[PDB]
Amino acid sequence: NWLIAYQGEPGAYSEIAALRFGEPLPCESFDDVFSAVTEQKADYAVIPIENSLGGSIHQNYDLLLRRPVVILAETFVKVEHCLLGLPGASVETATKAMSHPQALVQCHNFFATHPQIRAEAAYDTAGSAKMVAESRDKSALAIASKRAGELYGLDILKENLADEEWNITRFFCIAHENNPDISHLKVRPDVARQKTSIVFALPNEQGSLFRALATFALRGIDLTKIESRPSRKKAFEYLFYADFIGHREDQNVHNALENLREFATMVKVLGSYGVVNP
Amino acid sequence: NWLIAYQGEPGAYSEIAALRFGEPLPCESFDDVFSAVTEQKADYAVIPIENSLGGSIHQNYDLLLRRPVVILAETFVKVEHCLLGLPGASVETATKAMSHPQALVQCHNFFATHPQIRAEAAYDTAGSAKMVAESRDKSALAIASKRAGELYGLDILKENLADEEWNITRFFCIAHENNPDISHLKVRPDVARQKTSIVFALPNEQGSLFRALATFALRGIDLTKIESRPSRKKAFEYLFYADFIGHREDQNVHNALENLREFATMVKVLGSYGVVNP
């Protein structure tokens, strides 16, 4: 399969990401995206893992943890809103821009300055595009992806509509752990400074984490991420997410990992992977 | 009784959180929320900081660091969705459910198992209970808090509509830096197991975090949160959120923090605070 499962519809930032890997299969949900891989509808999938403005997506992490799945690449999507109209395109004739409530909030400047234009709640940003194109009504605007504009044949009225640059979504392209297949991806991950992601669980002892970092830091190994959150039905544990620069088969790495399993209640390696660029 | 600025409208979870602290003052932006304290329109604010399902809210940590403000308390709000309807309304009779797209998608099974009832996007959850009451048709329902339904005289048709039983948002009650008055909260925070929140930035050398954690760990100090993200501002660095148990001016803690301040690029204590139980 060259299908890349994702959550959303065409023009969604999630699709943008699956495009960097292959042919997008859209899915109703996260839970659904992981299942397209499990039951072999799709070989791959791209899941949003963190966003610079929000957090880590702990839902997608519980799924990475539970699904017999493996990360094969990471990618980074710059969420840049476009204000988007029908051909014959004007801001001073419009009565509304539709979009996802969070896009609407993020474009709160545009709205306080443009009160002839009222924020309208839409299910998502891509469908907002979609509505404009079908409503055959040059009055209604959408706030969405350039790709949505592309696609629904709309014009960009306005780029960087929120006064946030650095709204970035990082996604992980994933496959079933019983075939980390790199060869069928659209573009092969840049492996020059390859990353490993793991989850581990510590019994919540004063010191535990210092102790688990020691494992990497006294081994010369650089981290790029670390996060705790509590474990809910294991009594007195936290879960930790940690990424670091290194390949899981590297002996130093392997030594770190074994070192951790000495006192970690569990370790999982979600994968060693490179990066795909726009 | 005293003014707790929060983002949203009556009904909202953020309002439930406001109310554990005083009289809620609803605001359109978090910017408005902080600027409300930072210029004495209100004495406190209730800020969402993380959710067990998404993660940390980076954008809020962002403003907590840039604002002359201090954590006075934390509480934890269980985000519990209800199907709300007018007196007489029915799940077998309903045609629409209105809510925030995220609450829609978090009750995805409900919608799958009830195809008669179409999911319909709205600006937020509480405004959805409002729309239901104002439109007066018994065929249109909302997904919103139990509070939003009471306010609006809507019946609760189903308790616990979401896919995931464990949805919890952690809020900070905040105040102005040099108006850090606990007396005029509505109940004093439980301060037995007092927590301190800090943020800091390190030059990104391998072992940095280990060396920083060494600071608390070799000192008997127990962490309850650790998370990294990359310095939006300095070229080569990371920010870390740390929470731990103790007070700023414990001998221990102070030592730890001073040692930290030795090599951290920056340290700000966001505050030392206990916990408001509903």
Ligand SMILES: N[C@@H](Cc1ccccc1)C(=O)O
């Ligand atoms: N890479 C540095 C700093 C860092 C730690 C953890 C997460 C992100 C960055 C270290 O290895 O200690």
Ligand SMILES: N[C@@H](Cc1ccccc1)C(=O)O
């Ligand atoms: N409380 C333990 C484990 C822990 C670390 C960091 C965050 C949460 C828990 C410690 O101080 O190391």
